[PDB]
Symmetry: D2
Subunit: 116 residues, 4 copies
Amino acid sequence: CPLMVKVLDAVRGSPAINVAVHVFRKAADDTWEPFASGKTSESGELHGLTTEEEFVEGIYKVEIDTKSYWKALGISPFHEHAEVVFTANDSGPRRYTIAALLSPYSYSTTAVVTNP
Amino acid sequence: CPLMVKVLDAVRGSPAINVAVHVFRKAADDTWEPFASGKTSESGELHGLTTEEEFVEGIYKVEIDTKSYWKALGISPFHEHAEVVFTANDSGPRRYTIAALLSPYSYSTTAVVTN
Amino acid sequence: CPLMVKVLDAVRGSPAINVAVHVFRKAADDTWEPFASGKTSESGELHGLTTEEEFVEGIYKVEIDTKSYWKALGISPFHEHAEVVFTANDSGPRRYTIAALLSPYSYSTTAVVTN
Amino acid sequence: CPLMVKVLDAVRGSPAINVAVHVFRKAADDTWEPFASGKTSESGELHGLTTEEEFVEGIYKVEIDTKSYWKALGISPFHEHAEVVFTANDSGPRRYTIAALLSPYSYSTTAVVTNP
Ligand SMILES: *[B@@H-]1OC(=O)c2cc(/C=C/c3ccc4c(c3)C(=O)O[B-]4(O)O)ccc21
Ligand SMILES: *[BH-]1OC(=O)c2cc(/C=C/c3ccc4c(c3)C(=O)O[B-]4(O)O)ccc21
């Protein structure tokens, strides 16, 4: 699993379940091409987005759909989504975990990058 | 000052100085149109971005060029930049502070919306 | 103002108002001695805690009574309070801002140390 | 595992390894009695601190020794440690994960509380 996303809810003190995530990759013409998508599980985790073969060098954008999450819970949040934009695999293949902690008016994101 | 941006450095415990910040307004065809920009001050703040007349309801994106900031300090960072995307709403209070706390592999952002 | 405290609310996107804050100084026998206290203002800030003469080098603890803040809003929180423990050092810059961002099950804190 | 601690390093983008953690429990006389301690693994995780039988109702303090961590890496950080103080198990037994994200002048902590 070269790319995984984990999301927590800071209001409930729980995983953030059923959060939609869309991944994009910058194309040769500088536009954002759709790359993969999914939604977090009961554990707040999203596995299986991509494969080592498919996850080549590039600039990637991980869009976490925080507004749809909070709205689905009847809350009116500030942000449209959380965007995480990074260059991947430019010193060879790595494994990336993108973690996010959500509140209605705030979010934090961190990356864990390991060499397999 | 309907819109202010404040950036802090979690490695040095200081304002993040001379960081470029670009604000964009989502257009009817979903593209991002330049709206305002500047560089944070010695206190990590960027004032004077817009006026109440110009800052109408809509979706806005604040892009903070974190990568150049870290490179200038000799540190290799993870993100290309930090992005804060939000809807301005006339119902709610009238002044928006977008704050961001920067680390090489992480950032946090919060909105302080007051009258 | 050698020491300032600023508290923000991540659920409502606002200053955290009327929050009690207690500062303690570690004594030679390792107990925590009351040093200064107050309540955050309408802007979430507490100024005037100490003076440069009194704020000598040493270990200090800032306790933010987050539990009462959330209960007053009708929200059940996790922490008894937030604690920020640090050494004041004359070498480094002279003004300390302790900032804290509050959620029911989480908090973040950073130090902004300037001259 | 009723109590687990996970620590990440926001400068390196990695687990925070070999972080000492001391847990205390408030006694009947209002003092902090030592309850359990350990250090994080190569994965940044600390398991096996306590048992369901031992982890009774009480007010607990989890002290994460961030200064010793940063100093062991030759860095001069701001905080002495990160303290996480909470009432546990007062509506029956729960499982607690205490997570922390560290920088030299900043830290964030969140709790994940589940009912087994
Ligand atoms: B994310 O995790 C954080 O700890 C954090 C902190 C902040 C912003 C704190 C802040 C806001 C406004 C002001 C200060 C600090 C300050 O020192 O002076 B101020 O201009 O009044 C944002 C996001 C995250
Ligand atoms: B920003 O401010 C935060 O407090 C924060 C917290 C996190 C969470 C990271 C995390 C917690 C638990 C677990 C992982 C990651 C993980 O990879 O596995 B796990 O043990 O289930 C992210 C960002 C921010």
